[PDB]
Amino acid sequence: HGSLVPRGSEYDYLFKLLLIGNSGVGKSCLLLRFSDDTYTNDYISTIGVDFKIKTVELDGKTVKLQIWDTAGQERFRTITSSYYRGSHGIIIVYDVTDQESFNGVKMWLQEIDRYATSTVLKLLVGNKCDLKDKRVVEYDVAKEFADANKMPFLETSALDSTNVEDAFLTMARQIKES
Numbered sequence: 425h426g427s428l429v430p431r432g433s434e435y436d437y438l439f440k441l442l443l444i445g446n447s448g449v450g451k452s453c454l455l456l457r458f459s460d461d462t463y464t465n466d467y468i469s470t471i472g473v474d475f476k477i478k479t480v481e482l483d484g485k486t487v488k489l490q491i492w493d494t495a496g497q498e499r500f501r502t503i504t505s506s507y508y509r510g511s512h513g514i515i516i517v518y519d520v521t522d523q524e525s526f527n528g529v530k531m532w533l534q535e536i537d538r539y540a541t542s543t544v545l546k547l548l549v550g551n552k553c554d555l556k557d558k559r560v561v562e563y564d565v566a567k568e569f570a571d572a573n574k575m576p577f578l579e580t581s582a583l584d585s586t587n588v589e590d591a592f593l594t595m596a597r598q599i600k601e602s
């Protein structure tokens with residue numbers, strides 16, 4: 425007794441997102457910007473895997489985003505095949521001022537191709553677009569790469585908020601439209 429509150433399962437409209445990319449590209453700062461609207465100049469390298477839950481509204485419906493942050497440093501990784509296979513969508517992050525991080529994208533895509541399902545949603549993010557001064561990866565170059573791999577592409581800055589919400593909502597929409 426007494427009043428029924430109609431409820432569904434714990435995992436109803438819970439979308440699982442995975443952030444992958446080289447160390448230093450800004451995966452953790454992107455997540456912190458999106459979830460807390462906060463930022464740090466500090467480079468505190470992520471150990472293993474961790475998640476945050478961000479609740480958003482899409483087309484008048486509330487969906488929970490379970491976003492997994494990952495170690496970019498190999499010596500700190502715990503990520504296992506199931507993390508790829510258990511994700512609805514994967515965001516690959518590079519740093520537009522770091523050619524090596526962008527070269528690493530092909531290898532990250534091959535990790536997804538190895539361990540994720542053929543149908544996993546993908547999004548390419550070139551971070552640190554606030555560093556216009558230090559850009560080494562041209563938009564048109566990354567865009568052509570993304571196009572050839574049939575995935576959307578956004579440039580972002582965790583520092584000044586540019587496209588951050590858009591990146592995560594883009595992926596959320598990709599999963600919801602699925």
Ligand SMILES: Nc1nc2c(ncn2[C@@H]2O[C@H](COP(=O)(O)OP(=O)(O)NP(=O)(O)O)[C@@H](O)[C@H]2O)c(=O)[nH]1
Nearest residue numbers: 447448449450451452453465470496552581582583
């Ligand atoms: N200018 C600028 N710096 C950024 C941006 N995003 C992150 N950084 C900086 O770049 C460094 C690395 O950020 P971090 O979020 O830790 O990257 P990460 O990919 O999570 N690293 P790891 O894989 O090792 O955990 C930090 O010094 C951070 O302040 C951005 O958009 N612009």
Ligand SMILES: [Mg+2]
Nearest residue numbers: 451452469470
């Ligand atoms: Mg990190």
